[model samples]
Target chain A: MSFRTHLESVVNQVEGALACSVMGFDGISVDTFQKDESAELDLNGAWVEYANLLTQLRNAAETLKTGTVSEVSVNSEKVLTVMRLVSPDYFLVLALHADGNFGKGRYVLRVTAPKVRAEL
Target chain B: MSFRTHLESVVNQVEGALACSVMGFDGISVDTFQKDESAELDLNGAWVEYANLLTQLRNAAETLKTGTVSEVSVNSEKVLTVMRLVSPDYFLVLALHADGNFGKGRYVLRVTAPKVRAEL
Candidate 1:
């Protein structure tokens, strides 16, 4: 499968299990297979902020001479941001229900990170 | 030696070699052994900005689920910043003359990272 196809599949799998939305690092929608409209809206606008946030983070990593970022998450009342750093330049951001299986979200991202990094 | 002592020694070494100033993540002065007045002044105000910048970067790393940052750097006309991610919470920031041996600065940070990480 193509890189995007594989990435989309991963997104599909996560959405299927968590019933949430997944977005690209750029805040573009990748998949929103969740049934609830509220869930989708809650996660809709998060990618841009996440992208900006990721950029600042990359700068810090460079300053520290650390390798690229791996992942970051923030749990909120309306949304939970599960972001994975695919490289210094890209991320996979997920917006999930506040009560969703955050552990699973994290696990999926962890497993997908190396694959994404290898492709990119 | 205490963590601070070891860290202080590293600071001393870098300051000795670069003839520049070193600051902690909090922008607190750690070492200032440089000879040139202008070099010191240029690097003096950078720690606070760098501290703030590192915080944002850590946030990004967390979002990506990456391991803690390791190190980062930036070169400019007035100063060259060499930073090491001591932990999830701290960094070692150095401000050196722009014409200084950036390679040596980077090498020193790389050599010191493990030692700092071990102590902290």
Candidate 2:
């Protein structure tokens, strides 16, 4: 599937999905789609959020000599943020509400991430 | 069950489970348990890592009036870091490997969080 189509499928298939994106660890949206209702959620600044995380994980790994990065999530009161690394420079993120079908959203992100990496 | 046992069961029951902790967002461990195989994982510095995230998320919420802080995860190349807020002051974290049972790891963290909250 195309990258846009892959993202569209994720937001559409999952209930209460506010936004989905292919973005850099810096939080810049490489490509993104958001429901009108989802506009209030911060899709752009997510990189800073994810960046703060990846940097810490990266440093922790470097200092302690643990290993490399994998996957991380931030489940919050307002939303659920799941980030899957697609490559060293980019990743896929899904945002959902507590009332939304987060389980399906998580599943879809995990399922689509490898395809995203391969397509890249 | 004891807090220690609850944490123990999480690592034991979840495949690829390395360590689990009841920690403040401050990066201080309230209680933690690790396996011989899991010892390499930096469970201590994790809070400093998580602190960066919780702070950014907090700032995001304040600036945007998004909402309260919730769950967050860090998916990396080597380990999957999952954090769930058990209370305003504390959260539950799980560290897992790629070969580990992430599905179960996610489940256990989510299910055990509330219990951790009340017992705290």
Residues B1-120, model 2: lDDT tens digits = 357787887888887776788766554668877766544455445434443343333222221112334455554444655667666666677776655677788778878777777777
Best by DockQ: 2
Using Cα atoms, each model's DockQ against the true complex is: 0.03, 0.30
Report the C-alpha lDDT of model 1 over A1-120, residue by residue, as the tens digit: 234544554456554233333345443554443433344344544434333344443333332223322344443333444555555445555545444555566567667756756775
How does each model score on lDDT? 0.46, 0.60
Give me the overall lDDT of model 2: 0.60
lDDT by residue for model 1 (B60-90), tens: 3332223322334443323445555555555
Which is the leading candidate under TM-score?
A: 2
- The count of backbone overlaps in candidate 2 is 24
Candidate 1 reaches a DockQ of 0.03
